[PDB]
Design a binder for this molecule. Structure first.
Ligand SMILES: [Cl-]
Ligand SMILES: [Zn+2]
Lengths: 42, 318
């Protein structure tokens, strides 16, 4: 499995977007707390 | 509740950049100071909407500081020894912040002063941050002090000092350092976790963190363990080699040398703990509560290391 946001394939816990798509613990947790998708470099 | 305006300096630095991307994203307005508008990160920080930059030096430039804190409710301050004398810079910023009178939470990134806990000397790029910390407290600024664990992304195969993951000929990686092989060290994934953690601290407010020191480290691994992380995360064989002295393979600046020499003595010759403060002698507890979506050395090594190397000009992974 992979994260729709950060594409990581390594994470302690997988989460799902309010639709059902896989997000990593961090990305999923970040959105849940702040309301927006976790922003990345580059 | 409401998103506030945050003041930051050294925007291109790893701690700040992390906070800026995250904060801007969730809705906060950012007022940051950069040394130069030239550079990838700089241009990037420029591409983010609610981010205002002020190009100029920090040393003896109280005007930049005044402007920086105008309308600011929050501030994350992490200076570099390169910008000049950290104590004087760190004190001018604190004075400006107080003169602005609108700062509700002032987070300063501080570092220990080892000589205060043993015949150990003072790590030059670390010690002065403790003086600024005390001065922040002295002004009465509602504050919180964060102590960053060693960056995960300091690692590189390139001949950079202290944290080189040199690519030997036998298709393996060796890491040369003074740090004791079996002594757990405090690590931190700058890009991935500084931002979110800082946000949480702000969301909590000084009503919770005012006066506190927070070890910004989400996992403690010994050098052997760090290498076991890479070796188990890249199919390669990775070994740690303890060397009494740090290897400088590239023309670096003065300040940076002396800093390394201090490290050799403190960790190599005295085996003195990274965070010699008693409260820091589990340390990672406060951090992991502040933010649980942390990236450990295994994920960093398997998901980021290979990428940073590539864009850096290497194909060993391909
Ligand atoms: Cl900068
Ligand atoms: Zn993710």
């Amino acid at each position: 499995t992979t994260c729709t946001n950060c594409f990581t394939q390594t994470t302690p816990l997988w989460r799902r977007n309010p639709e059902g798509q896989p997000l990593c613990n961090a990305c999923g947790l970040f959105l849940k707390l702040h309301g927006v998708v976790r922003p990345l470099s580059l | 509740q409401q998103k506030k305006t945050i003041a930051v300096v050294n925007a291109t630095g790893r701690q700040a950049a992390s906070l800026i991307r995250v904060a801007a994203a969730v809705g906060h307005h950012v007022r940051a100071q950069v040394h130069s508008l030239k550079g990838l990160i700089a241009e990037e920080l420029q591409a983010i909407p609610n981010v205002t930059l002020f190009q100029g030096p920090l040393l003896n430039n109280v005007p930049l500081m005044d402007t920086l804190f105008e309308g600011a409710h929050l501030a994350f301050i992490n200076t570099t020894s390169q910008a000049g004398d950290e104590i004087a810079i760190g004190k001018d910023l604190a004075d400006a912040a107080k003169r602005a009178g609108t700062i509700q939470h002032y987070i300063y990134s501080s570092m220990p002063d080892h000589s205060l806990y043993g015949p150990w000397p003072a790590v030059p790029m670390w010690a002065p941050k403790f003086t600024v910390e005390n001065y922040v407290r002295q002004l009465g600024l509602p504050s919180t002090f964060v102590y960053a664990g060693i960056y995960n992304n300091n690692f590189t195969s390139l001949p950079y000092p202290l944290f080189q993951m040199e690519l030997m000929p036998d298709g393996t990686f060796e890491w040369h350092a003074p740090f004791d092989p079996d002594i757990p060290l405090p690590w931190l994934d700058a890009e991935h976790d500084v931002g979110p953690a800082l946000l949480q601290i702000f969301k909590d407010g000084p009503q919770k963190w005012n006066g506190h020191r927070i070890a910004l480290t989400f996992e403690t691994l010994s050098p052997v363990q760090v290498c076991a992380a890479f070796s188990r995360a890249l199919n390669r064989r990775v070994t740690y080699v303890q060397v009494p002295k740090v290897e400088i393979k590239v023309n670096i600046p003065v300040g940076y040398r002396e800093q390394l020499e201090a490290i050799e003595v403190v960790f190599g010759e005295h085996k003195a703990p990274y965070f010699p403060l008693p409260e820091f002698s589990r340390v990672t507890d406060e951090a992991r509560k502040l933010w649980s979506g942390w990236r450990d050395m295994e994920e960093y090594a398997r998901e980021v290391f290979p990428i940073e190397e590539e864009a850096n000009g290497l194909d060993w992974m391909l």
